[PDB]
Amino acid sequence: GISRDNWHKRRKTGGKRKPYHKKRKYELGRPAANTKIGPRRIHTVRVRGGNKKYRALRLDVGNFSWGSECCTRKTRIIDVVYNASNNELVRTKTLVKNCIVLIDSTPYRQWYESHYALPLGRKKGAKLTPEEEEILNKKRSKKIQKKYDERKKNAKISSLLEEQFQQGKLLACIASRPGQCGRADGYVLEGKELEFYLRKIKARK
Amino acid sequence: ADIQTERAYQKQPTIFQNKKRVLLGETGKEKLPRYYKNIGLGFKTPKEAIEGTYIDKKCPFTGNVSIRGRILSGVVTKMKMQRTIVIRRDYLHYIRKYNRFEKRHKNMSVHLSPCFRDVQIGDIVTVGECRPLSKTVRFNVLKVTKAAGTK
Amino acid sequence: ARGPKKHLKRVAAPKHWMLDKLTGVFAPRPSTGPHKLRECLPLIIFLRNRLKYALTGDEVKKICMQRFIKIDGKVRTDITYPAGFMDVISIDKTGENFRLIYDTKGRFAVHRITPEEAKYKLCKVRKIFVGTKGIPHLVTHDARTIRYPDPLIKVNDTIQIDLETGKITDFIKFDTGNLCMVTGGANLGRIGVITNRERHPGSFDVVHVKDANGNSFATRLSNIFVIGKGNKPWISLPRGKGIRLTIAEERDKRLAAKQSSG
RNA sequence: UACCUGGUUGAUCCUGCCAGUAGCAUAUGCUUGUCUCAAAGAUUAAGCCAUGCAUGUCUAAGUACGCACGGCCGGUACAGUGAAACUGCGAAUGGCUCAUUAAAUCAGUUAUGGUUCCUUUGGUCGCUCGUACUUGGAUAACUGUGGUAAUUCUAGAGCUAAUACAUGCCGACGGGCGCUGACCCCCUUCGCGGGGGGGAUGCGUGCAUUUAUCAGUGGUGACUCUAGAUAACCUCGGGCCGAUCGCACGCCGGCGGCGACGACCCAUUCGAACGUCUGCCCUAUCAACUUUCGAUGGUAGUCGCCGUGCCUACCAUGGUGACCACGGGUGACGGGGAAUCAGGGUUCGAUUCCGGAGAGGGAGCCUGAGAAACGGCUACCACAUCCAAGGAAGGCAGCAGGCGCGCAAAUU
RNA sequence: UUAAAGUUGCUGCAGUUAAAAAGCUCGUAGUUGGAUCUCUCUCGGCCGAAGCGUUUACUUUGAAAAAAUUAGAGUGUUCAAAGCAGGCCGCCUGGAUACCGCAGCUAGGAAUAAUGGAAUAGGACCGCGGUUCUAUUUUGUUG
RNA sequence: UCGCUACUACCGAUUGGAUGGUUUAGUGAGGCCCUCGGAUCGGCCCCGCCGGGGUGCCCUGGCGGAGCGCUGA
Secondary structure, eight states, rough: EEOHHHHHHHHSSBBBBOOOOOHHHHHHHEEOOBBBESSSSHHHHHHHHGOOEEEEEOOHHHHHHHHGGGGEEEEOOOOEOOOSOOSHHHHTBBTTTTTTTEOOOOOHHHHHHHHHHHOOSSSSSOOHHHHHHHSSOOOTTTHHHHHHHHHHSSOOOOOHHHHHHHHTTTEEEEOOHHHSSSOEEEEEOOOOHHHHHHHHHHHHH | OOSSSSSSOOOOOOOOOOOOOOOHHHHHOOOOOOOOOOOOOTOOOOHHHHHOOOOOTTOOOTSOOOOOOOEEEEEEOOOSSSSSSEEEEEEEEBBTTTTBBEEEEOOOOOOOTTTSSSSOOOOOEEEEEEEEEEEOOOOOEEEEOOTTOOO | SSSOOOOBSSSTGGGOOOOOOOSSBBOOOOOOOSSSSSSOOEEIIIIISSSSOOSSSHHHHHHHTTEEEETTTOOOOOOTTOOHHHHHHHHEEEEEEEEEOTTTOOOOOOOOOOOOTTTTEEEEEEEOOOTTTTTTEEEEETTTOSSSSTTOOOTTEEEEEEEOOOEEEEEEOOOOTOOEEEOOOTTTTEEEEEEEEEOTTTTTOOOEEEOOSSOOOEEEGGGEEEEETTEESSSSSSSSOOOOOHHHHHHHHHHHGGOOOO
């Protein structure tokens, strides 16, 4: 029953308007269906023109983009760590746009060790199971043994990312509006944005 | 840090600022490329729009607005908000019976970009029409000429 | 209202249809089609009012329902189909062919044309865009989209459409010295050579035109239709040659043309 | 046709008002032979409503097993005409009225580079590499059995369709393009080494969707545009990639020609919406207002067709005001226009065209391209109809007509 | 209700005695204000672009301004108010045009009226030197 | 200065009654959205009575039953 008209306000001078019609249908607004963390549940809406809006109520996965490596994989959303509008939305674990989430780094770890042949996020004791020994210590051909070592020089990672790879949980920021498209996509936090939101979460407590 | 005064991260959204570099990139220079664009009606983009560090999504030289419609003017009266000023336009209204005019005025709230820094009240400013930026703001400051009592 | 209007009052009709005051409350209300409803002549007005073939708005139904009427080479069974500028009306049971061109006074005209000319029409290019795996398109003023155009076709030019196939044969570009017809405004239906085109960026281009007698006029750019390359029209012209007579000499023509009688 | 005339004193010249005079509009009186056009329940009561009508719809081309007719010929799936009912579409227009409403509506002028658009017209529709010579279950009309005082109320039982509801291939199809990549080959090097080709194996491939990154065919006055490339996603309340009907009949078991319905997306048409600039009557016995509860602005989002305090969180303390804000009034819907008029003006504009609003008063929805719809639904407040007292149904500011009101307005 | 009403007055009234100048003065807003000042650079085929100059008001032209109404052209409705018809012996016609304030576009004029332009010269025009960033052509391609 | 008849309006006891408009507080029909709920309606199973085909086993046709089976509406 919400109405997002402009005529229920005061004028710029401060005078109140006497209205000249009743609430029209194109002025409507619908309730906020806040997207929580759970197994997927979307409910389609019928909007103007007969089109569809995917009003998501629970979401569990969403594909994110490691920007500096051109790697887009579908991860598992874990948590909400910080929301820069309201902080009661963090204790309610609501997924909105531009909220910082914890994702699962395991699809990116499998891409990194497949593309660069370097162990990422392993402990110092380095218990290396044989099923990934064949991708970390493979048998290379004559032209491939130089190609992998040619890739291996610039295969460095900023150390703020590797501490997240140690525990398996990356920081990500949602860039799509889940209550309107039904998806929770986004990107992985890298660099200056990462060390901004890190100290925001640290000073939050 | 001189930009990030907010609670979310101020970032120019078109520019990717996490490109991977090599040892001549980390030792050479920490270079943030900036996004600027040309307003198409013969308004020069200021050098502050090309050299600044401000972030503004409603700046007509660096943000996401396009100037279309009427291009107008007015003089500054009150600069007491965040990034927006109040200009008053003065005009004469012809009364037909008396064959005479009368002084009239109307105010406009108008967005002032941070590239136009050191603007004092009482100088002529060109404004340009865009989409609604807030409840009362629909024009954007395009060039600032100074009052004749300057030097 | 709530949703679109389906009626047209008679006094609210376009002036150039020349509907009288006392025949009804309503006017024919053109169907949606290629043309704006202010810029068109419905097929009921061309048959009943102009040509005097029909006598009522039921005989236009009885004529169009025998499929006797082709508008741009396709048979039209809507009596309020908006025929507009440069549209070819082929009636094959009688043997006539018409083209809708404006005359000097801002209306349309019964312009009978030869069936050797009725195989083509001109269109004006309105927007050119690429898309769909990099394939270029036109959009003309009839909403005809002709993908794969010539790369030297740009906006505001004139193509020549073959009406049996739909394809472009050859074109004219927007330049000075080209023969143009004005299709809107107070200089509507006037034919002259493009003299000059003044640019107003962020507003409308003004295109100064020169007559074949020396009478210069101007329009906005959107009321300009390039008809010929140089001074030779690629279509035929009406009985008057697109040259507007002032009312004094328009009177002199009548009071001297009655003196040929006896 | 740029006009005056009687009235103050014993008489005079003035100020000055009363009175006449001429239109034009509402009423009304008396009178009224012909003929042509023509307004007409606006004003008071946006008061109240008996009765009837004002919105429906089939082509060759969605569904025919009604003998309801008749018709070949009687094994001939369906000759035909066709009520009914399912399906589709419309009912959002037109008509009526003027209660609201004073920067609001509206008019001119621009904008959508900030959005949706049934339809029409043009485009596109083997562009995707992975039972089909045809898929599945119901349901009306119909038959048959009932309930209730009562309604365009419906319940149960038995059949049967689809362009309703669903599910779902083949074909094009041979490949191609990107990642991978055992292996093989070639050149050079004594050799190591360096460089270049071919390649089985697995993975992903279109166009729409959502995110991120790269480079810079066509465009604008200016795009964060249009296209291109790369990595992924693609909603079970699913996104396209046709299980459809007709008419003439065929060409060498295949290959067919004209249509009708569909259909995502693009364009167009018809619009709608939200904005820009300028403009309106009376009042100061209305001079300060707005800001807890959004007032002005900033940041992040929510919602919404989209731009925005539209809304929420955190901030900043602003925004309008003698150039008359704010408040009140209007015997105010606004214009196009109408009366009068030397020139200037003044007053009217409910009323047939454009735009707004509203269907007794507020409010909320369903369906749909489009409605906050009232000849749709759900409530509440106000009236009010039937009743067997348990219930049921309402909305004339549509056309007629009635009552009431009134100085004041036509035919069921 | 309009004219008459120059009895609302901008045109165009009145204010000593007929109704009426504030007791006097200062004063912000408003309103009004004295003389004065005679188009060029980089390109295309001498002719077009692009720039102006300090910004406007004014004036003239243009284009855009719904139809109906109003004005007005044509036409013997039997005249007229109307209408958009008609006319000739199948043809020939018409269905024009003006007006459409203020605001907004456009182009010419430069009188009037507002406004700038250097006065502790961080002033104009010249060629001289320095500091910082940096174009993308140059070296048969290639770093 | 001082005598008769009536109207207009206000005060006007009566804490006379009835109804509007602004708000204080409390209450809150009905729709929509969310989280549940699950009356009923299928489907797939499993056995039992059994045919045919292929070769004790698989697929088919009629049913019947049971299960807090496991799914859809």
